Design a protein around this motif. Structure first.
Motif, PDB file in Angstrom:
ATOM      1  N   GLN A   1       7.338   5.284   1.220  1.00  0.00           N
ATOM      2  CA  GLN A   1       5.630   5.323   1.185  1.00  0.00           C
ATOM      3  C   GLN A   1       5.016   5.070   2.318  1.00  0.00           C
ATOM      4  O   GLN A   1       5.177   4.081   2.922  1.00  0.00           O
ATOM      5  N   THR A   2       4.183   6.182   2.690  1.00  0.00           N
ATOM      6  CA  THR A   2       3.287   6.000   3.752  1.00  0.00           C
ATOM      7  C   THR A   2       1.747   5.699   3.511  1.00  0.00           C
ATOM      8  O   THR A   2       0.961   5.457   4.444  1.00  0.00           O
ATOM      9  N   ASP A   3       1.311   5.703   2.300  1.00  0.00           N
ATOM     10  CA  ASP A   3       0.017   5.199   1.821  1.00  0.00           C
ATOM     11  C   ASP A   3      -0.003   3.768   1.526  1.00  0.00           C
ATOM     12  O   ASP A   3       0.792   3.222   0.602  1.00  0.00           O
ATOM     13  N   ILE A   4      -0.459   2.946   2.580  1.00  0.00           N
ATOM     14  CA  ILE A   4      -0.577   1.643   2.531  1.00  0.00           C
ATOM     15  C   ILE A   4      -1.746   0.918   1.916  1.00  0.00           C
ATOM     16  O   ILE A   4      -3.218   1.192   2.695  1.00  0.00           O
ATOM     17  N   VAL A   5      -1.722   0.224   1.072  1.00  0.00           N
ATOM     18  CA  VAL A   5      -2.873  -0.498   0.517  1.00  0.00           C
ATOM     19  C   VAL A   5      -3.148  -1.702   0.936  1.00  0.00           C
ATOM     20  O   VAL A   5      -2.241  -2.583   1.086  1.00  0.00           O
ATOM     21  N   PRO A   6      -4.266  -2.262   1.721  1.00  0.00           N
ATOM     22  CA  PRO A   6      -4.512  -3.542   2.153  1.00  0.00           C
ATOM     23  C   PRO A   6      -4.454  -4.812   1.199  1.00  0.00           C
ATOM     24  O   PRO A   6      -4.802  -4.861  -0.030  1.00  0.00           O
ATOM     25  N   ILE A   7      -3.673  -5.741   1.753  1.00  0.00           N
ATOM     26  CA  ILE A   7      -3.249  -6.899   0.923  1.00  0.00           C
ATOM     27  C   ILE A   7      -4.110  -8.012   1.378  1.00  0.00           C
ATOM     28  O   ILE A   7      -4.889  -8.841   0.609  1.00  0.00           O
ATOM     29  N   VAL A   8      -4.165  -8.199   2.551  1.00  0.00           N
ATOM     30  CA  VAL A   8      -4.864  -9.389   3.146  1.00  0.00           C
ATOM     31  C   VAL A   8      -5.704  -9.130   4.232  1.00  0.00           C
ATOM     32  O   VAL A   8      -5.489  -8.292   5.100  1.00  0.00           O
ATOM     33  N   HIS A   9      -7.102  -9.555   4.040  1.00  0.00           N
ATOM     34  CA  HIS A   9      -8.062  -9.416   5.113  1.00  0.00           C
ATOM     35  C   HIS A   9      -8.006 -10.665   6.268  1.00  0.00           C
ATOM     36  O   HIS A   9      -7.933 -11.834   5.702  1.00  0.00           O
ATOM     37  N   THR A  10      -8.010 -10.319   7.500  1.00  0.00           N
ATOM     38  CA  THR A  10      -8.158 -11.296   8.400  1.00  0.00           C
ATOM     39  C   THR A  10      -9.118 -10.859   9.483  1.00  0.00           C
ATOM     40  O   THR A  10      -9.752  -9.789   9.391  1.00  0.00           O
ATOM     41  N   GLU A  11      -9.923 -11.619  10.046  1.00  0.00           N
ATOM     42  CA  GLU A  11     -10.956 -11.627  11.049  1.00  0.00           C
ATOM     43  C   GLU A  11     -10.541 -10.874  12.226  1.00  0.00           C
ATOM     44  O   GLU A  11     -10.995  -9.698  12.469  1.00  0.00           O
ATOM     45  N   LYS A  12      -9.203 -11.388  12.851  1.00  0.00           N
ATOM     46  CA  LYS A  12      -9.069 -10.914  14.162  1.00  0.00           C
ATOM     47  C   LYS A  12      -8.329  -9.471  14.141  1.00  0.00           C
ATOM     48  O   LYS A  12      -8.516  -8.885  15.075  1.00  0.00           O
ATOM     49  N   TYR A  13      -7.539  -9.353  13.158  1.00  0.00           N
ATOM     50  CA  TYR A  13      -6.908  -7.991  13.074  1.00  0.00           C
ATOM     51  C   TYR A  13      -7.104  -7.145  11.756  1.00  0.00           C
ATOM     52  O   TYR A  13      -6.646  -6.014  11.572  1.00  0.00           O
ATOM     53  N   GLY A  14      -8.472  -7.308  11.029  1.00  0.00           N
ATOM     54  CA  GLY A  14      -8.726  -6.477  10.025  1.00  0.00           C
ATOM     55  C   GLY A  14      -7.819  -6.472   8.715  1.00  0.00           C
ATOM     56  O   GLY A  14      -7.235  -7.474   8.267  1.00  0.00           O
ATOM     57  N   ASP A  15      -7.924  -5.450   8.067  1.00  0.00           N
ATOM     58  CA  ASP A  15      -7.028  -5.163   6.605  1.00  0.00           C
ATOM     59  C   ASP A  15      -5.761  -5.156   6.708  1.00  0.00           C
ATOM     60  O   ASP A  15      -4.934  -5.308   5.531  1.00  0.00           O
ATOM     61  N   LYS A  16      -5.091  -4.525   7.782  1.00  0.00           N
ATOM     62  CA  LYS A  16      -3.628  -4.178   7.691  1.00  0.00           C
ATOM     63  C   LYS A  16      -2.992  -4.449   8.883  1.00  0.00           C
ATOM     64  O   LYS A  16      -3.003  -3.813   9.949  1.00  0.00           O
ATOM     65  N   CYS A  17      -3.007  -5.855   9.297  1.00  0.00           N
ATOM     66  CA  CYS A  17      -2.561  -6.465  10.514  1.00  0.00           C
ATOM     67  C   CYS A  17      -1.393  -6.068  11.176  1.00  0.00           C
ATOM     68  O   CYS A  17      -1.255  -6.014  12.325  1.00  0.00           O
TER      69      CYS A  17
END
Length: 246
Positions: A162-178
């Motif tokens: 699976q190559t379609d990756i849905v964002p789980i966690v938001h981070t300030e420094k690294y965005g949605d897909k750290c």
């Protein structure tokens, strides 16, 4: 201190079918679980597959109430010290035999998952089965990318990864897909440049936990720091996971 994730085996790969058939075990009635250890139960939403090693001979164990666990003797030995010195598995099954089996992983928003190989999965640490969250695990992201690149070589299908990756966690420094960000900023080209990955595993765990916000699930909008124990409890309550130490 680990959380053991119960990954339900739904349809076994053709060469495993014979073995289970020959050993009277049936995946459609009985619950047969691959047990994967994780330290990040909050990331379970973003599971895209499941990792086992081709070189490990896994045991199939009876856990009661028609539940069966596929792990290593040493992993299972622990799950019981919470009264034997050795537990004979019903039978053993090599990692290769399980590749391509369909699975249902707890809380995973991705569907139609499969069991895939990872040669560097240890026999002496954890359960022999490894969790896969490419959005937040650099190691997972890199292995995923390799499998996608050389499916023939690793003996899989391009569709399985699976190559379609849905964002789980938001981070300030690294965005949605750290994991994606860290592999890209630190220019991690392969699963062979091991320096930048060990550094990346660390930074991702730190920011994720302390500066992370859930983008998905029951606790969407909560700081990971707060959501982590709550998600853990839920999975245990629902019989999808359990605690296990070494």
């Amino acid at each position: 201190g680990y959380v053991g994730i119960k990954i339900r085996l739904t349809d076994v790969a053709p060469q495993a079918q014979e073995l289970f058939k020959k050993e009277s075990l049936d995946v459609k009635e009985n619950k047969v679980y691959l047990v994967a250890a994780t330290l990040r139960p909050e990331t379970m939403y973003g599971q895209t597959c499941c990792f086992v090693s081709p070189k490990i001979d896994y045991g199939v164990f009876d856990a009661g109430n028609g539940d069966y666990f596929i792990t290593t003797e040493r992993a299972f030995k622990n799950m019981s010290f919470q009264k034997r010195g050795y537990y004979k598995p019903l039978f053993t099954i090599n990692g290769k035999t399980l590749i391509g089996s369909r699975i249902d992983a707890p809380y995973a928003v991705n569907k139609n998952l499969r069991v895939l190989p990872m040669e560097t999965v240890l026999a002496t640490k954890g359960t022999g089965v490894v969790t896969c969250v490419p959005s937040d695990s650099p190691d997972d992201f890199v292995t995923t990318r390799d499998l996608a690149n050389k499916p023939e070589y690793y003996g899989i299908e391009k569709d399985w990864v699976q190559t379609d990756i849905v964002p789980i966690v938001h981070t300030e420094k690294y965005g949605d897909k750290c994991a994606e960000f860290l592999v890209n900023d630190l220019k991690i080209q392969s699963p062979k440049d091991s320096v930048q990955l060990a550094n990346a595993k660390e930074l991702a765990y730190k920011e994720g936990f302390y500066n992370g916000t859930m983008l998905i699930g029951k606790y969407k909008g909560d700081k990971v720091e707060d959501a982590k124990p709550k998600v853990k409890q839920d999975l245990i309550d629902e019989g999808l996971a359990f605690v296990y130490n070494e």
